[PDB]
Amino acid sequence: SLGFLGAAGSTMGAASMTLTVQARNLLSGIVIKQLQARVLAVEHYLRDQQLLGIWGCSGKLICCTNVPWNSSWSNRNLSEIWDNMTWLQWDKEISNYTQIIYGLLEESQNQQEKNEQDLLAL
Amino acid sequence: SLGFLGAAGSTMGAASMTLTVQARNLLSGIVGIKQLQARVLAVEHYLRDQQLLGIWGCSGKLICCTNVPWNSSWSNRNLSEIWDNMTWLQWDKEISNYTQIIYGLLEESQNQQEKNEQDLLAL
Amino acid sequence: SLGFLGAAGSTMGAASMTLTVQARNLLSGIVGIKQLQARVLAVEHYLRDQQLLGIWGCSGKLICCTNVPWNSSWSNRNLSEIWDNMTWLQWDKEISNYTQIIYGLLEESQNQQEKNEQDLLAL
Amino acid sequence: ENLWVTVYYGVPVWKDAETTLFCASDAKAKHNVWATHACVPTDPNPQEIHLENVTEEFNMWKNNMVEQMHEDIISLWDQSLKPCVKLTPLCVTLQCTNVTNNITDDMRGELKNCSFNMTTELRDKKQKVYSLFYRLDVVQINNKEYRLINCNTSAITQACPKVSFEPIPIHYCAPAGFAILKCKDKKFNGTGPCPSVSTVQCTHGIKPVVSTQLLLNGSLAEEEVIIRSENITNNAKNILVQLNTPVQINCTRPNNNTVKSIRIGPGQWFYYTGDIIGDIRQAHCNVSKATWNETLGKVVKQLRKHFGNNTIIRFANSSGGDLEVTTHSFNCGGEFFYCNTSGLFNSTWISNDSITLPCRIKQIINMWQRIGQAMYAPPIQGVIRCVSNITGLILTRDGTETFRPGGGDMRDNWRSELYKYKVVKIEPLGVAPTKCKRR
Amino acid sequence: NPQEIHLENVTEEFNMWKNNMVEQMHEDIISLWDQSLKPCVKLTPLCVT
Amino acid sequence: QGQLVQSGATTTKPGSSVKISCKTSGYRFNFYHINWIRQTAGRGPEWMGWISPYSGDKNLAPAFQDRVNMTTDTEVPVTSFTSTGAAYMEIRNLTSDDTGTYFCAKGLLRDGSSTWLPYLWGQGTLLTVLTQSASVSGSLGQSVTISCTGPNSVCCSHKSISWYQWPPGRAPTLIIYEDNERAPGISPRFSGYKSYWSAYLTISDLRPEDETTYYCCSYTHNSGCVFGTGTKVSVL
Ligand SMILES: *[C@@H]1O[C@H](CO)[C@@H](O[C@@H]2O[C@H](CO)[C@@H](O[C@@H]3O[C@H](CO[C@H]4O[C@H](CO)[C@@H](O)[C@H](O)[C@@H]4O)[C@@H](O)[C@H](O[C@H]4O[C@H](CO)[C@@H](O)[C@H](O)[C@@H]4O)[C@@H]3O)[C@H](O)[C@H]2NC(C)=O)[C@H](O)[C@H]1NC(C)=O
Ligand SMILES: *[C@@H]1O[C@H](CO)[C@@H](O[C@@H]2O[C@H](CO)[C@@H](O[C@@H]3O[C@H](CO)[C@@H](O)[C@H](O)[C@@H]3O)[C@H](O)[C@H]2NC(C)=O)[C@H](O)[C@H]1NC(C)=O
Ligand SMILES: *[C@@H]1O[C@H](CO)[C@@H](O[C@@H]2O[C@H](CO)[C@@H](O[C@@H]3O[C@H](CO)[C@@H](O)[C@H](O)[C@@H]3O)[C@H](O)[C@H]2NC(C)=O)[C@H](O)[C@H]1NC(C)=O
Ligand SMILES: *[C@@H]1O[C@H](CO)[C@@H](O[C@@H]2O[C@H](CO)[C@@H](O)[C@H](O)[C@H]2NC(C)=O)[C@H](O)[C@H]1NC(C)=O
Ligand SMILES: *[C@@H]1O[C@H](CO)[C@@H](O[C@@H]2O[C@H](CO)[C@@H](O)[C@H](O)[C@H]2NC(C)=O)[C@H](O)[C@H]1NC(C)=O
Ligand SMILES: *[C@@H]1O[C@H](CO)[C@@H](O[C@@H]2O[C@H](CO)[C@@H](O)[C@H](O)[C@H]2NC(C)=O)[C@H](O)[C@H]1NC(C)=O
Ligand SMILES: *[C@@H]1O[C@H](CO)[C@@H](O[C@@H]2O[C@H](CO)[C@@H](O)[C@H](O)[C@H]2NC(C)=O)[C@H](O)[C@H]1NC(C)=O
Ligand SMILES: *[C@@H]1O[C@H](CO)[C@@H](O)[C@H](O)[C@H]1NC(C)=O
Ligand SMILES: *[C@@H]1O[C@H](CO)[C@@H](O)[C@H](O)[C@H]1NC(C)=O
Ligand SMILES: *[C@@H]1O[C@H](CO)[C@@H](O)[C@H](O)[C@H]1NC(C)=O
Ligand SMILES: *[C@@H]1O[C@H](CO)[C@@H](O)[C@H](O)[C@H]1NC(C)=O
Ligand SMILES: *[C@@H]1O[C@H](CO)[C@@H](O)[C@H](O)[C@H]1NC(C)=O
Ligand SMILES: *[C@@H]1O[C@H](CO)[C@@H](O)[C@H](O)[C@H]1NC(C)=O
Ligand SMILES: *[C@@H]1O[C@H](CO)[C@@H](O)[C@H](O)[C@H]1NC(C)=O
Ligand SMILES: *[C@@H]1O[C@H](CO)[C@@H](O)[C@H](O)[C@H]1NC(C)=O
Ligand SMILES: *[C@@H]1O[C@H](CO)[C@@H](O)[C@H](O)[C@H]1NC(C)=O
Ligand SMILES: *[C@@H]1O[C@H](CO)[C@@H](O)[C@H](O)[C@H]1NC(C)=O
Ligand SMILES: *[C@@H]1O[C@H](CO)[C@@H](O)[C@H](O)[C@H]1NC(C)=O
Ligand SMILES: *[C@@H]1O[C@H](CO)[C@@H](O)[C@H](O)[C@H]1NC(C)=O
Ligand SMILES: *[C@@H]1O[C@H](CO)[C@@H](O)[C@H](O)[C@H]1NC(C)=O
Ligand SMILES: *[C@@H]1O[C@H](CO)[C@@H](O)[C@H](O)[C@H]1NC(C)=O
Ligand SMILES: *[C@@H]1O[C@H](CO)[C@@H](O)[C@H](O)[C@H]1NC(C)=O
């Protein structure tokens, strides 16, 4: 337990084990312009849950998907990522294809919902 | 991929296959008293829609089935006469007579389903 | 059906069977700088209640059971001495000494449960 | 066969509604009266989505975007007028003369040289100064004594000389969960079901041009010329004519006026009309005669579609009322022009070179909604000349037929542009029966 | 209790001359000065000989 | 709902070309195809062709390939879901052998496998291979079963079968479509069944108004209605 943003410079795997400590400080704390920031802040939180729900990860901090990993995004290996980099430099390197990944997650969850609706008809 | 509200005049089944495209533009986009009042108003409608979504047990899912049956007095039409035959606009226009009753029945059915699950999990 | 806050003086179990009736009147109704400040504040309390609901793994459900046990030092009373014996008001009055500890333990239990599920899904 | 209810989030169903609309303008940076700096600057791509098989009922005469824009424009005028210097000390007795006005003995009163005592930076001292006032801004007392028109009726404040009254495009937009319905029918009457409907988040660039009897810098009809009215059979409802070929108008004041900065009080410097360099001429507007005749012909050919091919209609000038109603009134270069339009609507049409219009100049203008607040337009130096497109008309029926122009309400000018747009809300929840059951 | 959390292994690029807190504080101070100056008595009558 | 009104009953000698109008009301004229079907005295009911008042894409029978001309004009939206339209049809090399009653009928749905099927029929205008049961009858309370069959060019799952009730010279009415599904408002006493070589229409608990003739249609998603000979029912 290191606190809020404690594992900024740590490896990605070390920071992955403490996700609630950052999740519980996204809309709380002590919060005319000032009220505008709160109304703006909640829109970004709901922006984060809207994308969370549209991918089928409603109410879960770690969710696995059906889309595969494209090597053109990053050629590095698993032991070359989790015990090898911090989230800052990872987000710096992969910041070239995040939107594409988000769209693929959206469409994969949409087709998964359609498949479940088709399957539930027997 | 037709975009936001692309299947307005389309059949209900065709629009049902693209639900994310309308769901992702309900609280985002580009949105001084007038400007801030609309955002606070807009977020209340999303939470109005999500609160009803959760009270029926459809939390975080765009297609959810229920336990309540279909009452013929609401509408006598058939399935193939709805999904491949009508648009969502005229459907909401015609069924706008009994929506409150259906919402109440969904509420009570989910409540009794939760009570039944609480009773069953005691073994 | 007694309405909103009907079972204030009733036993806790009696009020437990009507939870939707109180849940549907937390952000709706009929709700102007003063007026807008309360709306923005009111939705923060609903999200304050919903955020804690999601971090414990009870996303979108009014009755959820947990993995943490009951500590006798909190309260020594029995089940028939709680559900058929007291109202929610006096219960919240009595248990208002250790709620924060319970909330933290719920947080950590859900976190470890998520970690266990991530470990198990790797086969 | 036991069919169960199924919920869908994000169904294409909308309902007509009224909501608050915000302003967005393309980037240009001084600061105009419309406070367009306070609106969002960048429009990347106004993404219009054609809604096929969607025929929706529009009603421009019950539209709510127009009322919102009306109140917003009033708010912009008063917001720009709030921090400027008050002119309460200016309501005094004036000694006025015809300075070289007695040339032909015609336009002697049009502009007048007035001297008077006025306050200075020190409370105890006074200063006697002179200026030039247009005829339309002063009223006699009775000798050569005069007084401002607004003194007996309202308080007076001048505009700050940095804000420009030139209109710039405004894109009106709807918040999240709302949309604007654009009807793309080229023969849209303005009311009823539109067969080809599209959706947008923002309108096109709309300029707030305050004009009368002639719509300036407006949108063009794609085909024919379109005639709109609530109850065309009612003479008490104005007729809005929209053209497809714009007619160009050239307005000018050639009097080379000069400004004289005079200090009224602490941190307050007034701008009077100092002198006129060169000749003293008349402000006027030109329009080509043949183009006006052709556009009048195409207007009457569509007017005949609701009154008969054989009935003969004619065009005459205004019937009376306030100054702003009986004239072509607008804001050119900054100063307010009022042009006599008797030379335009002076033709009778039977079953089957350029002209010029004299204009007078005002700088004391009162608000068209509430009387009790008056704005002094600071005089503009040099020679004023503006070229504009007349694209629409505001006619009034009398009850053969005669048509007289007019329309003194500010919201007519906005109705001339927001007929294509309709604001709707989205209820994205939809229930329908299916053969699926939970668990 | 101003809770400061040391971010170890974190080397971050700072730039005080392009910082935005300073300009914001400048405008806040100006706004506060004018807010305090708004309701007090004007001295226009004081400009005499 | 929805209603379709036809033109007048005028007569003309061979060699000419006549036009028949069909005005629609009470529904989106763009949402459904329109079919023209002619009932001849010396022949069975013949599907002539359909067009789409939305896509303008036409498809006729090869017997009317180079001899019939069918057009429409744009709709007039009445409400968000009601429209008024028209449809015109002519025959170029027209003789006196094409005498009969012509019907214009709107499509069944706007999607699926039975889109263009003639569902809502008109009043009928007076002008100048699939075999079914010969004749069957019954009494009040019992059930009847009418057969329908034809060669491999018009039989089998390969195609879909519909069942129509048709009073002589009057407005028809659809009973069964895609081999088992019945039209809305049809009593459950009617049942459709389909074997690999024939289709059966079962009618239990008969009633006096059922004294009528019946036909069956063989049709795919992009073809025409292949009618039958006819089954004359008797009593009352
Ligand atoms: C606005 O409203 C109009 C009118 O309702 C809609 O147009 C309908 O669109 C649907 C599909 O969107 C059409 O139904 C489909 O027709 C397909 C082909 O029909 C064409 O066939 C030939 C091929 O070129 C054309 O010559 C002919 O004129 C038709 O245009 C079918 O393929 C569809 O499925 C059927 O066939 C396939 C074949 O593989 C099978 O797999 C299926 O199971 C099924 O049997 C389907 O039938 C319908 O015909 C159109 N109606 C009209 C009047 O044109 C618009 O779609 C609508 N717009 C929006 C945006 O919703
Ligand atoms: C409006 O009226 C005022 C009077 O209140 C005019 O100002 C006066 O104009 C006269 C004539 O130009 C000036 O007299 C001249 O003075 C100069 C300089 O001493 C002298 O060389 C000339 O021979 C002549 O005598 C007078 O000084 C001036 N007074 C003031 C206070 O300005 C003004 O010109 C009028 N405006 C117009 C547009 O006519
Ligand atoms: C209708 O639109 C036209 C153009 O879109 C307007 O004409 C514009 O009028 C203004 C002031 O009358 C002109 O501004 C001046 O421009 C000159 C250019 O050298 C500048 O030196 C001046 O300081 C001043 O800024 C503007 O140029 C002119 N635009 C064009 C293209 O000619 C017209 O005013 C509009 N009509 C109404 C009633 O507002
Ligand atoms: C007056 O009308 C003419 C013609 O409608 C305008 O010229 C058009 O301007 C638009 C936008 O600037 C162009 O897309 C067109 O190609 C132009 N066409 C022609 C024939 O010039 C002109 O801009 C209008 N002037 C004013 C002041 O509104
Ligand atoms: C209007 O009058 C002003 C003077 O009041 C003229 O301004 C002069 O313009 C010329 C241009 O070459 C300059 O050289 C002079 O220095 C200007 N004089 C002053 C006092 O600034 C202006 O040119 C006149 N305009 C018209 C159209 O007549
Ligand atoms: C109004 O003024 C404009 C420009 O001052 C005139 O338009 C010009 O017309 C001449 C024709 O001799 C062309 O050569 C120019 O190119 C035009 N200028 C522009 C900017 O297009 C117009 O003719 C005048 N109209 C009237 C009625 O006087
Ligand atoms: C079907 O008949 C219509 C007439 O209602 C034909 O439409 C006209 O045909 C003529 C001759 O080709 C053209 O000059 C007209 O422009 C057409 N339209 C109208 C509105 O008159 C149509 O061509 C005929 N169909 C075929 C295939 O010939
Ligand atoms: C990787 O991405 C490229 C371009 O985005 C695409 O063509 C390719 O199919 C992708 N491969 C995989 C395995 O996803
Ligand atoms: C990301 O894109 C930028 C600009 O195209 C490029 O300079 C950079 O090398 C890219 N990085 C990766 C990891 O693809
Ligand atoms: C249908 O609704 C009516 C009144 O809402 C009710 O009396 C009836 O029992 C309902 N039927 C079914 C089958 O739910
Ligand atoms: C749906 O089917 C019915 C069947 O009678 C038909 O009347 C209607 O026009 C069809 N379309 C709609 C939008 O209801
Ligand atoms: C809704 O109810 C009203 C009043 O009972 C009735 O007039 C109307 O026809 C009904 N509409 C529908 C679609 O049931
Ligand atoms: C009860 O709580 C105390 C302190 O909060 C702790 O020491 C003890 O282990 C707990 N026991 C149980 C059974 O939860
Ligand atoms: C809670 O604490 C208060 C004082 O802090 C005490 O009076 C009360 O008895 C306590 N109740 C329980 C149930 O521990
Ligand atoms: C200006 O001239 C007109 C011409 O009739 C005259 O009536 C008026 O009194 C004059 N004003 C003066 C000299 O102040
Ligand atoms: C200014 O005041 C004096 C007071 O003696 C008066 O004589 C003079 O007429 C006033 N000025 C004007 C323009 O009336
Ligand atoms: C002010 O004077 C004008 C001059 O004619 C007059 O029309 C108007 O009625 C007067 N206003 C009042 C309130 O007397
Ligand atoms: C405008 O045109 C529509 C189109 O049908 C018509 O219904 C309406 O009556 C017309 N209104 C006027 C005022 O002419
Ligand atoms: C239009 O006005 C006339 C008389 O002014 C009136 O009789 C008629 O009812 C009005 N039209 C409508 C739709 O009310
Ligand atoms: C008027 O002339 C037009 C020609 O454009 C014609 O269509 C219309 O029928 C005529 N109306 C009358 C009443 O003669
Ligand atoms: C406008 O001019 C006409 C003649 O050109 C004239 O009769 C009329 O009185 C004038 N109007 C005004 C307000 O001067
Ligand atoms: C108006 O028309 C009449 C007759 O054509 C003509 O005598 C008169 O001079 C015209 N006046 C104007 C201002 O056009």
Short mmCIF file of C-alpha atoms in Angstrom, two decimals, chain E residues 4-48:
data_model
loop_
_atom_site.label_atom_id
_atom_site.label_comp_id
_atom_site.label_asym_id
_atom_site.label_seq_id
_atom_site.Cartn_x
_atom_site.Cartn_y
_atom_site.Cartn_z
CA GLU E 4 2.44 14.72 0.17
CA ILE E 5 3.25 11.45 -1.62
CA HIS E 6 6.80 11.04 -2.91
CA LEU E 7 6.84 9.68 -6.48
CA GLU E 8 10.02 7.63 -6.58
CA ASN E 9 11.61 6.74 -9.93
CA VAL E 10 9.64 9.65 -11.40
CA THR E 11 11.67 12.16 -13.40
CA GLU E 12 9.31 14.75 -14.86
CA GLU E 13 9.88 17.76 -17.10
CA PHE E 14 9.00 21.08 -15.45
CA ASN E 15 8.84 24.52 -17.07
CA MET E 16 8.09 27.45 -14.76
CA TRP E 17 8.17 30.02 -17.58
CA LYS E 18 5.39 28.25 -19.51
CA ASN E 19 3.51 27.32 -16.33
CA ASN E 20 -0.20 28.13 -16.30
CA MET E 21 -0.79 28.50 -12.54
CA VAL E 22 1.03 31.86 -12.62
CA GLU E 23 -1.15 33.53 -15.26
CA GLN E 24 -4.28 32.12 -13.61
CA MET E 25 -3.19 33.51 -10.23
CA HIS E 26 -2.49 36.87 -11.88
CA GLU E 27 -6.06 37.02 -13.18
CA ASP E 28 -7.43 35.79 -9.83
CA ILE E 29 -5.59 38.56 -7.96
CA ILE E 30 -6.88 41.18 -10.40
CA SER E 31 -10.43 39.82 -10.05
CA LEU E 32 -10.20 39.90 -6.25
CA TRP E 33 -8.90 43.49 -6.29
CA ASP E 34 -11.78 44.64 -8.49
CA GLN E 35 -14.30 42.62 -6.44
CA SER E 36 -13.16 44.37 -3.26
CA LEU E 37 -13.17 47.72 -5.08
CA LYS E 38 -16.67 47.35 -6.56
CA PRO E 39 -19.00 48.21 -3.62
CA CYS E 40 -16.95 51.08 -2.16
CA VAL E 41 -17.72 54.77 -2.66
CA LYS E 42 -16.69 56.43 -5.92
CA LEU E 43 -14.52 59.56 -5.77
CA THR E 44 -15.73 61.36 -8.91
CA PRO E 45 -16.83 64.42 -6.83
CA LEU E 46 -13.26 64.65 -5.46
CA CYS E 47 -11.88 65.82 -8.84
CA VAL E 48 -12.11 69.59 -8.28
#
